[model samples]
Target: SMEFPFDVDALFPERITVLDQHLRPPARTPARVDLQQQIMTIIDELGKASAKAQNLSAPITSASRMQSNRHVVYILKDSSARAGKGAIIGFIKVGYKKLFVLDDREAHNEVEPLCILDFYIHESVQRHGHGRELFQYMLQKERVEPHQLAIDRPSQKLLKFLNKHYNLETTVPQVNNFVIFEGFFA
Candidate 1:
């Protein structure tokens, strides 16, 4: 709803060109050693951010979990404060998982679909429509609609979030232990 110091489209690369490159004194260009270092630094910082966000006992995301998981991580940065190195305000991790689900015709089906594995926003901006912006951006970038999503084992708050944001309030019609939404097949 509202754009702020965090107007970056995707992660790592920030927004704004008023301070265009080549005009700056110390620009890090491709093939430059400094640029590689910059990227590595950002990657490390992002890993730390991921760990911090989970409040996990240790760096699960930093070690085997993140290394093994094949999901994509979308980071939102706020350049309004940190200049070129805008701080990451939050992230949404998404991936595809195989599951037995229902088709639009009420038939049992085996399908792999996109799922919202993990979603979170900084508490500072959690209630300020930041999550909405991130979600809309994700859908647009990924080229999918909300009804076409297969949400993970979402928390109660996450469930409420889905209800409030997308009006995606239901997914009942299965008799077995499998859980999936109508949109997954639609």
Candidate 2:
């Protein structure tokens, strides 16, 4: 069994209770119109933030593309939660899986893979270990395969954090614009 630093149970002390309180039966589904609007608004803000970082802008108008090409998940905490503000703190986009050769001359490898397209936590919430916890939660829920996620060039702090806490084998020559870090579960 794997061990974690903090008490996961405490972090989500009333997880089942909370779900029971908030979740309704499938028969009481909310209108699709409202849900789509909420999703779009969140996507727009995320896109704008990406643009500021010189990362790829989210294709907001391509609903079909969004639906087909990727599995997107977003989580929003209530305004009264810790840090005392409402924000779209984290998101993950996993691409369609396929078999592809890692090297040009190598035979095709069976790989059902996904990438961490983007991730972020608000400034106020930094250093509280939220990022690590969130990443763990996502992995467990999604059943992500080891060696599927590749962490690209990030800030020095992030690079170090992943190396130390996640036990990632980071590459040298930090000058490279990107690096692919892989992990696995045994």
lDDT per prediction? 0.57, 0.44
Residues 1-186 of candidate 1 have per-residue lDDT tens digits of 123242233324543111111222123234445443443343345455545665645542332243366666555666455434346566676777777776656777777777776666666666877678778878887788887777655666666787898887777566544345556565
lDDT of 2 by residue, 121-152 (tens): 55555676666766676677667743455444
Q: Pick the lDDT winner.
A: 1
Error of 1 at 121 (Å): 0.8
Model 2 residue 69 CA deviation (Å) reads 1.8
Q: What TM-score, to 2 decimals, does candidate 2 have?
A: 0.57
Q: Cα deviation of 93 in candidate 1 (Å)? A: 1.5
Alpha carbon lDDT at 134, candidate 1: 76
List the candidate 2 regions with Cα displacement exceeding 4 Å: 1-30, 54-65, 76-86, 97-112, 152-157, 171-178, 182-186
- Candidate 1 lDDT score at position 178: 39
